[PDB]
């Protein structure tokens, strides 16, 4: 199986191995600092740790982790410009955890600057939808994403809640279904979906609980291992 969006730096080896033995043998960990950086260079190191240490720490437990890098809105360092430079260099698998939160202009810039660069490197993005204005925010996101004419195959709206699944559907981007509740199975009415537990720092087995609830069986293989097409693997 496979589980996009899952913060590794917030999981212990024990928790990790629980994934190995449950089917979740493939995950996509995204960059995220549980506190706002004082220096933009920090992110770089969080990246170094995320792509040179985490994958081993994971495979050693029996899980093939696919790292993702970027800059979460809740931790935008001052000279965020400094973090896009290092990025525009090294080759990447995908831009993880990026988006808007308080619709601040600061996010828009840090968000745009990234999704923009992403278009020049043809690398996927996992935009994140806020928990607060998960409807007033996704609009703006889906609005920013609109202008750049971002290809409907390089972005995935995540945390697509029950009362907004219509909004993102009016688009051609991929929709991420986070189980965290479990009544998302019925949301299979239609096929640009992906199951993600989003196992963070705070249980960590939802990308299979409902990933299996689908009595529709077989077909389901495109909600669990459909994130491999998006994530080119």
Rule CB under 8 A: is residue 89 a binding residue for a copy of itself?
no
Query: Left if phi > 0, otherwise alpha if psi is -120 to 50, otherwise beta: which for 61?
Result: alpha
Task: Output the CA torsion sign for 203, 208, 211, 213.
Answer: negative
Q: State the nearest-atom distance from the C-beta of 32 to Zn ion, in Å.
A: 7
Helices (H), 3-80: 13-20, 40-52, 54-59
Among 166, 189, 202, 215, binds a copy of itself (CB under 8 A): 202
Of 106, 12, 17, 9, nearest to 48 by C-alpha is 9
Task: Give the side-chain half-sphere CA count within 13 A for 175.
Answer: 22
* For a copy of itself, the closer CB: 16 or 144: 16
Among 3, 9, 26, 211, which residue interacts with a copy of itself (rule: CB under 8 A)?
Answer: 9
Structure tokens at 50: 């995320």
Whether 99 and 129 have beta carbons less than 8 Å apart is answered as yes
* Residue 116 assigned to a binding site: no
> Quick one: what does residue 202 bind among Zn ion, a copy of itself, none, with the CB cut-off 5 to 8 Å set by partner type?
a copy of itself
- Asked whether residue 198 is marked as a ligand-binding residue, the answer is yes
CB of 141 to a copy of itself, least distance (A): 26
The least CB distance from residue 50 to a copy of itself, in Å, is: 9
How far is 137 from 129, CA to CA, in rounded Å?
7
Question: Residue with CB nearest Zn ion?
Answer: 128
Residue 128 interacting with Zn ion (CB under 5 A)? yes
Q: How far is CA 50 from CA 8, 38, 90, 96, 151, in A?
A: 8, 19, 13, 11, 27
Least Å distance between CB 57 and Zn ion? 16
**Dihedral sign, Cα of residue 20, residue 23, residue 25, residue 28:** negative
> Does position 42 bind a copy of itself by CB under 8 A?
yes
Residue 189 annotated as binding site: no
Q: How many residues bind a copy of itself (CB under 8 A)?
A: 30
- 128 makes contact, choosing from a copy of itself, Zn ion, none, with CB < 5 to 8 Å by partner type, with Zn ion
Contact 18, 208 (CB under 8 A): no
Contact window for Zn ion (CB under 5 A) among 9-17, 51-59, 63-71, 191-199? 191-199
At its nearest, how many Å lie between Zn ion and the CB of residue 170?
22
The rounded radius of gyration (Å) of the Cα atoms in the chain is 17
Residues that bind Zn ion (CB under 5 A): 128, 198
- Provide the annotated binding site for Zn(2+): 5, 7, 97, 128, 159, 198
Q: Which residues are annotated as a binding site?
A: 5, 7, 97, 128, 159, 198
């Amino acid at each position: 199986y496979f589980d996009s969006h899952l913060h590794s730096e917030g999981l212990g080896f024990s928790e990790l191995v629980k994934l190995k033995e449950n089917g979740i043998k493939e995950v996509c960990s995204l960059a995220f600092f549980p506190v706002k950086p004082k220096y933009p260079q920090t992110m770089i190191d969080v990246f170094r740790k995320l792509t040179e240490f985490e994958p081993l720490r994971c495979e050693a437990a029996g899980v093939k982790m696919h790292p993702a890098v970027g800059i979460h809105p809740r931790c935008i360092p001052p000279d965020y410009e400094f973090v896009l430079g290092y990025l525009e260099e090294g080759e990447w698998v995908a831009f993880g955890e990026i988006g808007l939160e308080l619709v601040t202009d600061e996010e828009i810039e840090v968000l745009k600057s990234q999704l923009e660069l992403a278009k020049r490197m043809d690398v996927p993005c996992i935009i994140h939808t806020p928990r607060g204005n998960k409807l007033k925010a996704t609009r703006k996101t889906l609005e920013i994403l609109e202008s750049l004419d971002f290809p409907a195959d390089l972005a995935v709206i995540d945390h697509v809640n029950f009362e907004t699944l219509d909004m993102v559907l009016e688009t051609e981007y991929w929709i991420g279904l986070t189980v965290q509740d479990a009544a998302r199975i019925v949301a299979e009415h239609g096929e640009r979906f992906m199951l993600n537990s989003d196992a963070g720092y705070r249980v960590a087995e939802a990308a299979v609980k409902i990933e299996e609830a689908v009595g529709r069986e077989e077909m389901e293989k495109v909600a669990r291992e459909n994130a491999r097409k998006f994530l080119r693997v």
